[PDB]
Amino acid sequence: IAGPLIFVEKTEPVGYNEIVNIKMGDGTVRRGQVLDSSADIVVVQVFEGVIFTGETLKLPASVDLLGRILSGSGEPRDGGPRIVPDQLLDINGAAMNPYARLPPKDFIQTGISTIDGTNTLVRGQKLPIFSASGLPHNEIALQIARQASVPGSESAFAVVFAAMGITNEEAQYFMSDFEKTGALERAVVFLNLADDPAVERIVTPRMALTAAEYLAYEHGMHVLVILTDITNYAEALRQMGAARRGYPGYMYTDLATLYERAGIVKGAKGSVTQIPILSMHPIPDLSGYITEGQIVVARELHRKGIYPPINVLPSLSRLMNSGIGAGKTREDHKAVSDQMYAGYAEGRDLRGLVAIVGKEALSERDTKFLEFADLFEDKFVRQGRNENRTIEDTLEIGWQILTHLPENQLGRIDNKYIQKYHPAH
Amino acid sequence: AGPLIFVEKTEPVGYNEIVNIKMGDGTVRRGQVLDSSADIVVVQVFEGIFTGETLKLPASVDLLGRILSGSGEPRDGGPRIVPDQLLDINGAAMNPYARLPPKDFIQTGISTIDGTNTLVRGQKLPIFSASGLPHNEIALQIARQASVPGSESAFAVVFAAMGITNEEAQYFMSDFEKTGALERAVVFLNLADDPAVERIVTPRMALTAAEYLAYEHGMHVLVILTDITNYAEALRQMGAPGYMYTDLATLYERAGIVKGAKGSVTQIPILSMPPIPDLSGYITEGQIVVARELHRKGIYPPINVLPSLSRLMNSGIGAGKTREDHKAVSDQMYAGYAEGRDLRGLVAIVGKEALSERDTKFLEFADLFEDKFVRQGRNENRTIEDTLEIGWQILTHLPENQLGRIDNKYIQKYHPAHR
């Protein structure tokens, strides 16, 4: 009803509104009120002495997590045996602070040009996929899961895919796609089904993040966290206890408990990077999750039959400068990125000019820019479902379609880079 | 086939109807009838009987101070059209755009805009919101407050509203009337019922009028387009080529510095939620986000700066533009606020007193920023100097050696701890 909202391990019968004490991993006890509970997990609303004192819900932490498929509670879903831990970690983020005071940094290679090329994802970043209902955002996100890597990083890489409020059909789809490609081998998957207890859905993200932190910090790994639907999560939030539409007031604080949990870790040798998926009667503000930019799925592109239907003009990466350039990608990266962006906007603008003046009333120059916005979409943006591009290959594509423009018309690439890189030099 | 145009309906006409049209140019083109309305025929022209003239706005400097009606006719009971130009509406009218980049400052008097996501002369900066949020209120404030300090050209506002209620229209009228704002503005109002072909011509009527004033009169013109979503809704309610994605393009292409460089057309389109559409095409030079979270907190104007962005900001700010420290103060507030909002997550999870002293001063700053920089009176017009001074004000609350983003030159000079 008012939050903050922590997750306790239903160990003995609780009642609604019960005042309970929660004993943190720290050794300190926080007072709170029972909000709601499933059958194994209790949801408490904290405040800040012979009453119930409960244990904080914990993740069976282990390297053995990799290659396993679990439910929202982190209970085995693959037929495998239960998870033998060596670390029971407080799921609420409140036991370890793995996060260092360091800006997010190096390159993560998604294999997707409209990401790696112009909206580069950086290690320790939060970069959501802004989509809507009916677009292949899940297809994107699991392509990203099959393909992401950290070129030349001596820290190993892992992915934590978490899917919430999903159907049995699409459950079966992820499980098969993760196993038969091999992407599962380096991944811990948490699948919450639209069916499973509302509550279990809500811990799903805190389970996923907690895990990510374990691999990042205590095993020196780069972990990419992918969360299929933050709107599905919000919905679950608006159906807790007392709740006549709209969303709780503590939603905003709550989401912040999710998006505070990312970055480079103490010791610099690992990191947590987030790619939340934001889809779209109810009108959820998930604004706070968008502080480093966002990647944008455009129905327009979807309609022309373009996959992935990513629109770079609205897309953004605020930390892209920290992950590109010499010894990270290549020096011409900013240049190519800037020039394509500039050139695609121009050609996109000119599609309007066309339908004002008529096609034949366009200047030679303009027709080249109009033809480029085309080449950009068909050759750059379009990319197979299982087509993993090196940034090298992505930057080359950029250059190949930039050739279509007048060389005197590349005000974003210093002669330094045209001389060295341009396919006619 | 080819481009859409708009013609005066001399008489009734069918469909797929081959017709002759007299452009403002003087050349005659043929096409077909897309949609027979009442006052206006939508034509699909050929190569880039019935005798018709293209619909055109009576372009004249006396458009200023007039409240018109999307169709171009008067709504303020004022006298009729007083032509000086008679210009086509589609965008062909003047070919007035000097292909140059946006370059100077537009002072909206709104700190979350001016200070953090600066609006540059010649920019398209879509304000992005949802229903239930006061975007029209912001749009309306910008209309009366907007100015171009240090510009030796005249400033002018073109406000165009689509698919609005009577009450809204009356509100907008009085507001323009009483606040002395209309004295510098052209206002096109389209009611949510009058019919639809008319909602469509609205923006084109506005932009032609803007292009007229900017190009042919050396003015800097802000075009506030209030609700592209309404526009989109009317666009599907009709016809069966120029098809929304392409059609918006005819809209978002119409901005920039004009030839001569002695003027500009700047455009602020309102984009709301929640049915269709995809109007991302309008987003290329930034966006200003209106957040419901901030609104359910009782803050006006409810702009979240973190997701907001102006891609062209660096061209509007600095030395002879605003002030030298602008970018430093703007970055440090962005970094300080971003940080404080995350620590709200942290506080929830660990507890207020579990939190570091430094982290606490950041958490407290996120509050000062929302309470003092963002919160602003419906009718308070903040100079950029006002905007920057309250910045430095709330900055003081941060431990001086935590201001990474500001070079010592500006700290030693502007920081209040040492005047």
Ligand SMILES: Nc1ncnc2c1ncn2[C@@H]1O[C@H](COP(=O)(O)OP(=O)(O)O)[C@@H](O)[C@H]1O
């Ligand atoms: N932080 C953000 N918050 C909200 N929208 C954003 C943000 N960043 C970019 N956008 C853009 O907002 C658009 C969503 O609106 P869209 O569906 O295109 O139009 P509308 O919602 O008006 O129908 C996306 O195209 C996206 O690029």
